[PDB]
Design a protein around this ligand. Structure first.
Ligand SMILES: *[C@@H]1O[C@H](CO)[C@@H](O[C@@H]2O[C@H](CO)[C@@H](O[C@@H]3O[C@H](CO)[C@@H](O)[C@H](O)[C@@H]3O)[C@H](O)[C@H]2NC(C)=O)[C@H](O)[C@H]1NC(C)=O
Ligand SMILES: *[C@@H]1O[C@H](CO[C@H]2O[C@@H](C)[C@@H](O)[C@@H](O)[C@@H]2O)[C@@H](O[C@@H]2O[C@H](CO)[C@@H](O)[C@H](O)[C@H]2NC(C)=O)[C@H](O)[C@H]1NC(C)=O
Ligand SMILES: *[C@@H]1O[C@H](CO[C@H]2O[C@@H](C)[C@@H](O)[C@@H](O)[C@@H]2O)[C@@H](O[C@@H]2O[C@H](CO)[C@@H](O)[C@H](O)[C@H]2NC(C)=O)[C@H](O)[C@H]1NC(C)=O
Ligand SMILES: *[C@@H]1O[C@H](CO[C@H]2O[C@@H](C)[C@@H](O)[C@@H](O)[C@@H]2O)[C@@H](O[C@@H]2O[C@H](CO)[C@@H](O)[C@H](O)[C@H]2NC(C)=O)[C@H](O)[C@H]1NC(C)=O
Ligand SMILES: *[C@@H]1O[C@H](CO[C@H]2O[C@@H](C)[C@@H](O)[C@@H](O)[C@@H]2O)[C@@H](O[C@@H]2O[C@H](CO)[C@@H](O)[C@H](O)[C@H]2NC(C)=O)[C@H](O)[C@H]1NC(C)=O
Ligand SMILES: *[C@@H]1O[C@H](CO[C@H]2O[C@@H](C)[C@@H](O)[C@@H](O)[C@@H]2O)[C@@H](O[C@@H]2O[C@H](CO)[C@@H](O)[C@H](O)[C@H]2NC(C)=O)[C@H](O)[C@H]1NC(C)=O
Ligand SMILES: *[C@H]1O[C@H](CO[C@H]2O[C@@H](C)[C@@H](O)[C@@H](O)[C@@H]2O)[C@@H](O[C@@H]2O[C@H](CO)[C@@H](O)[C@H](O)[C@H]2NC(C)=O)[C@H](O)[C@H]1NC(C)=O
Ligand SMILES: *[C@@H]1O[C@H](CO)[C@@H](O[C@@H]2O[C@H](CO)[C@@H](O)[C@H](O)[C@H]2NC(C)=O)[C@H](O)[C@H]1NC(C)=O
Ligand SMILES: *[C@@H]1O[C@H](CO)[C@@H](O[C@@H]2O[C@H](CO)[C@@H](O)[C@H](O)[C@H]2NC(C)=O)[C@H](O)[C@H]1NC(C)=O
Ligand SMILES: *[C@@H]1O[C@H](CO)[C@@H](O)[C@H](O)[C@H]1NC(C)=O
Ligand SMILES: *[C@@H]1O[C@H](CO)[C@@H](O)[C@H](O)[C@H]1NC(C)=O
Ligand SMILES: *[C@@H]1O[C@H](CO)[C@@H](O)[C@H](O)[C@H]1NC(C)=O
Ligand SMILES: *[C@H]1O[C@H](CO)[C@@H](O)[C@H](O)[C@H]1NC(C)=O
Ligand SMILES: *[C@H]1O[C@H](CO)[C@@H](O)[C@H](O)[C@H]1NC(C)=O
Ligand SMILES: *[C@H]1O[C@H](CO)[C@@H](O)[C@H](O)[C@H]1NC(C)=O
Ligand SMILES: [Cl-]
Ligand SMILES: [Cl-]
Ligand SMILES: [Cl-]
Ligand SMILES: [Cl-]
Ligand SMILES: [Cl-]
Ligand SMILES: [Cl-]
Ligand SMILES: [Cl-]
Lengths: 526, 527
């Protein structure tokens, strides 16, 4: 099973999926290995190769810190890379239906991981199911994360910032030149991702270099206007200079700072990333997107406000409990091993950790806005409020606020609210419907009748997978089945959204309006 | 002849014809020695005896006060101006008795408001002839000293100890205990009621050990001591006294010389300077009012309330829907009683600086945030309505609710109302809605008089409010009838049930303006 790309032939492998067949091509190189003189630089286009590339196993994951807070725990370890770490990691994967399609829609997955972690080869990103059930072509790339991906000495081509974003954009460029040879339609390409993946997709709506490289966009639990997504030039420069200091690379001029950084072992870079931001949070993104004047021609909120971005259709959404995952990474009183019932004071300590630079009036005003209890007897009040504080501020409110502005320029927007907690979720019950745990439903893992999961979870995933594909193909996440539930456009006034769960999905309006009003209209003044 | 022998002497009254019946009115009975000369600023002194028969057939002098003159000829403002001669010789009370004479009637004692600076018992809206006719209760009202003459304070000093006006109220209560039986009254069934500063006063008699045996129960209309305007700290009070002395050229070595000089000033000279003892006042500013004097009030009232140190009895408490609107035409930019007063966001913010002079920019910004979650925009009247609600909630509604809640935690029955009817004869514009003080005419039964141009529906409402007040006074339960009547449940800190009062339908609701009051009790203080 061989395909001639513009750079050479690639051998693939036949997968047997659900009685049918899917053809997979794992680890196709799409850029030159960013090594030596090439570390910190934008990805260089690839040159032809003589023999045949065996695209039969996942490639190296990009250099990154590993989450080892809970050794042996499936809930944390499932996000860690499952192939070797290496700077030689610029590769992508293509999944294709059998029999081979003629002009198939392409879905391109961009993984999350706070711009510091992530890899395309995770089991929860296996695109074979989508290829089988909806007969789309699925692509996913590895892009550089952390300092190696986002170190910025702004204005300097030797370390310009947003290198990982250019990686993704180069992978998109690859699809355009090569996907017809796989039976895909370059003219029908939908970007989707989650967390930093979603913020990445949203930045691709803004970058002129990405304008001609895709068609529609799906944003799961993330957008560029989230408070963690984009770092200012001053902060990015400070962080870079802190890293130079931490690694013994503090130099007189920038060209020498970089020479020295190019000579550090990857691990001396990785293990120093944690120290560059003086009072980080469990949500702190050490090295991420910045305004480089290249990929991002200007500050994002301004571009969006002014109206210069790709005019197309989007599908945006969030999980019910986006904030709970981060509480066990340093909020006092919390633990994945107990119920984590906290007190008013532990809650105030929590705010301190999640809101380090904020005045006492500001924190006090957050406490006030999230303490108007329905039942004042309820002992889990503070635990839930802190989770909501962190979810609304970091994910939910940015996502709604993005969708309002985007739709205000006459674009079809569809908003979802994912409310189902997987019966397999390794994290304890109080954590609810966690950040990241809708992904396996999108990628159709519960369609596998040997995979554990409930029947209802198979049906739920069946329709999500159907709407995602139909949104990709058609620009409307419509479902079949004369029952269905009819998904309506998102508008600044009514703000209609669809809920997703196993016991009846319904159309609601103004998601968390009372909470979000605080974050968009008051908090920026404290 | 109509003649009652009292401890102080015989008193002659007059018959009034009310609703085809008769009420006997004794207007302007002295209950204390005239606080003149050396008695100025002192506590009231007991009345010995008057000579011959005192003719209580006309209302007495009202106490010295400044007059509202912002609107000449306008009934809306002028109905609160005193309607008898002004004088320092003003310590008199009024008694209305049903005819024929009761043997043991329940007594209602009215205490007027006017921000401790103004007011008089002789206003038409406090005529007690109706309540006496219809419910056969005895009605008493008294004049008490207001302003500097009433509340000049140098605590510890008997020449001007503070709270003299409150002690005037108290002495009148004492007079009722001593004398009401001769009028056919029951001194063991006495209910205090008042509005605004009158209600703050009533709430203060609940705290004052000297008042504890001079009444039975208490009704509080739009006011309580815990409202931001009600009580001055001990040294803010002294400060005001010292400043008044400076303004009038009475600043001296010692305190008794200061008072000595102030006793030689014309009342007008003192009265015209009251408004300058405070550097930055609001339309709701109480220049001279109640304070912690050590005699009447042994500690800050909030502390006494928290500690359960008050008279354990039943209370009836309530507020009007638009408490704050009245104050806006007296200072806030954009507002006018002859305009519909559509204001902008910037006008709103300027209004906030008027009503909250000393509050930080962030304090004001958060009041703004809390009051602008609009149901509908642009809807021009949003900001106008918002500012009225801010003023009303902060000064009247939220403290009244907080007071009832805290009072009921100590085990006595409390009943809360929300008065929502706008009088068909209200002279103020529509935008001011259900105003401060405009439930009073309904409580006193004025709409029962058919020759008066109220609607039938207003008569029915008033007849019902008159019955419930009178029932509360008599029984500690503001019932109307058993059968065909909406029951008024107790106010408990959990459910916080209250009764709405209007002409459409009266009903039981819960947690009045809980979301707004939550801001004023639990966030604003920290600001
Ligand atoms: C409103 O509710 C109260 C109960 O809280 C009722 O109080 C009761 O009132 C009756 C008179 O209607 C009292 O009984 C009688 O009083 C008269 C003097 O008025 C006397 O002649 C009789 O010998 C007898 O004592 C009764 O003490 C009192 N009960 C209690 C425990 O308060 C009131 O009747 C209700 N009113 C209406 C119209 O619903
Ligand atoms: C820009 O950098 C400085 C220095 O940051 C230091 O922070 C340490 C945690 C460590 O990473 C080290 O390598 C790095 O150089 C930041 O200023 C510091 O702020 C703290 C108070 O939080 C002070 O105690 C320090 O005096 C001060 N820096 C020093 C070392 O003088 C600064 O905050 C940062 N700017 C931004 C954007 O936050
Ligand atoms: C779905 O579950 C089955 C077994 O059911 C669970 O039993 C629990 C006590 C615990 O072992 C849990 O891990 C397990 O999921 C899984 O089958 C077993 O998987 C284990 C490895 O975890 C193998 O060692 C066993 O040989 C295997 N067989 C059994 C016991 O039936 C199965 O892997 C799982 N499926 C997925 C994809 O999650
Ligand atoms: C209170 O008023 C009376 C006069 O007014 C009343 O006189 C009653 C006898 C009775 O008829 C009643 O209806 C009427 O309103 C003053 O009367 C004094 O005594 C006689 C009786 O009229 C008069 O001729 C006197 O002029 C008058 N005395 C004086 C001082 O001249 C009574 O004095 C008065 N009391 C007070 C304290 O002023
Ligand atoms: C008590 O109050 C005085 C206020 O001074 C007042 O003087 C009055 C005669 C009157 O004119 C009034 O308008 C004026 O405000 C406080 O005095 C402050 O500080 C000095 C005097 O020490 C004055 O020069 C200031 O003007 C005054 N403040 C302001 C802004 O007016 C005094 O501090 C205060 N003391 C206490 C214990 O409350
Ligand atoms: C009994 O009287 C009612 C009115 O009495 C009402 O009083 C309120 C304070 C409250 O207690 C409420 O529960 C109670 O119903 C009479 O109803 C009235 O009838 C007239 C016509 O005759 C209507 O025009 C009024 O709107 C209406 N008043 C209301 C509902 O507020 C009614 O006559 C009588 N009902 C019965 C069943 O006998
Ligand atoms: C930025 O800095 C590098 C290195 O910094 C050098 O600065 C010199 C003035 C001196 O202090 C030296 O010790 C220090 O290392 C510059 O490279 C230098 O270039 C000069 C000639 O211009 C050589 O003589 C030095 O040997 C050389 N240093 C090394 C090790 O390369 C570089 O020129 C400068 N570039 C920019 C953009 O300013
Ligand atoms: C004042 O009112 C009283 C009470 O209504 C009147 O006295 C009553 O008069 C009627 C008829 O003359 C008698 O039947 C009653 O018995 C009287 N009551 C008493 C206690 O005497 C009296 O007429 C009025 N006085 C006036 C008009 O000055
Ligand atoms: C008026 O009613 C009161 C009760 O409200 C009677 O006064 C006394 O009531 C106390 C309890 O508060 C009892 O201990 C006494 O027995 C009552 N006094 C007497 C002498 O019986 C009072 O009697 C009534 N006054 C009347 C009818 O003139
Ligand atoms: C696997 O590969 C063959 C070619 O070697 C391809 O034609 C076919 O689609 C695949 N076979 C199946 C059905 O798995
Ligand atoms: C490619 O795959 C085939 C089949 O497994 C294998 O025989 C061959 O060695 C591989 N080629 C390379 C590049 O090693
Ligand atoms: C749960 O575990 C954490 C971490 O060990 C601990 O600090 C906390 O006190 C525990 N919570 C409860 C309910 O005891
Ligand atoms: C895909 O088919 C051809 C390229 O094979 C292209 O001309 C056409 O416009 C595309 N459109 C679709 C969605 O069929
Ligand atoms: C949904 O898919 C596309 C939307 O444009 C269209 O071809 C199809 O008719 C639609 N079906 C339903 C049931 O909405
Ligand atoms: C009416 O109120 C006063 C009239 O003197 C004025 O200052 C205000 O601007 C007017 N309001 C409006 C614009 O209706
Ligand atoms: Cl960040
Ligand atoms: Cl430098
Ligand atoms: Cl730049
Ligand atoms: Cl099925
Ligand atoms: Cl009648
Ligand atoms: Cl209007
Ligand atoms: Cl009742």
């Amino acid at each position: 099973i061989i395909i001639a790309t513009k750079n050479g032939k690639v051998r693939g492998m036949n997968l047997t999926v659900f009685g049918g067949t899917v053809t997979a091509f794992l680890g196709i190189p799409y850029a030159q290995p960013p090594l030596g003189r090439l570390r910190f630089k934008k990805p260089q286009s690839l040159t032809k190769w003589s023999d045949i590339w065996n695209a039969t196993k996942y490639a190296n994951s990009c250099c990154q810190n590993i989450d080892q807070s809970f050794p042996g725990f499936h809930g944390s370890e499932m996000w860690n890379p499952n192939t070797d770490l290496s700077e030689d990691c610029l590769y992508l994967n293509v999944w294709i239906p059998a029999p081979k399609p003629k002009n198939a829609t392409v879905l391109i997955w961009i993984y999350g991981g706070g711009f510091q972690t992530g890899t395309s080869s995770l089991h929860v990103y296996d695109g074979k199911f989508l290829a089988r059930v909806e007969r789309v072509i699925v692509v996913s790339m590895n892009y550089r994360v952390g300092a190696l991906g986002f170190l910025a000495l702004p204005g300097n081509p030797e370390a310009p910032g947003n290198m990982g974003l250019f990686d993704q954009q180069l992978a998109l460029q690859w699809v355009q030149k090569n996907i017809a040879a796989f039976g895909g339609n370059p003219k029908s390409v939908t970007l989707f991702g989650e967390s930093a993946g979603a913020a990445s997709v949203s930045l691709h709506l803004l970058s002129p270099g990405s304008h001609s490289l895709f068609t529609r966009a799906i944003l799961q639990s993330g957008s560029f206007n989230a408070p963690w997504a984009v770092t200012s030039l001053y902060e990015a420069r400070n962080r870079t200079l802190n890293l130079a200091k931490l690694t013994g690379c503090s130099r007189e001029n920038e060209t020498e700072i970089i020479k020295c950084l190019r000579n550090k072992d990857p691990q001396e870079i990785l293990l120093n990333e944690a120290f560059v931001v003086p009072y980080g949070t469990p949500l702190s993104v050490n090295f991420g997107p910045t305004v480089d004047g290249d990929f991002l021609t200007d500050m994002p909120d301004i571009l969006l406000e002014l109206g210069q971005f790709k005019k197309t259709q989007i599908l945006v959404g969030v999980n019910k409990d986006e904030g709970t995952a981060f509480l066990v990474y340093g909020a006092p009183g919390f633990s994945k091993d107990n119920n984590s019932i906290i007190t008013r004071k532990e809650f105030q300590e929590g705010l301190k950790i999640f809101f380090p630079g904020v005045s006492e009036f500001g924190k006090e005003s957050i406490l006030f806005h999230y303490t108007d209890w329905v039942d004042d007897q309820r002992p889990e009040n503070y635990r839930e409020a802190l989770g909501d504080v962190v979810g609304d501020y970091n994910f939910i409110c940015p996502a709604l606020e993005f969708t309002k502005k985007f739709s205000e320029w006459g674009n079809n927007a569809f908003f979802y609210y994912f409310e189902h907690r997987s019966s397999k979720l390794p994290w304890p019950e109080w954590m609810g419907v966690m950040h990241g745990y809708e992904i396996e439903f999108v990628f159709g893992l519960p369609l596998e009748r040997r995979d554990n999961y409930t029947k209802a979870e198979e049906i739920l995933s069946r329709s999500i997978v159907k709407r995602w594909a139909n949104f990709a193909k058609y620009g409307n996440p419509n479902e079949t089945q004369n029952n269905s539930t009819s998904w309506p456009v998102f508008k600044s006034t009514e703000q209609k959204y669809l809920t997703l769960n196993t016991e009846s999905t319904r159309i609601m309006t103004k998601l968390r309006a009372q909470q979000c009003r605080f974050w968009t209209s008051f908090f920026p003044k404290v």
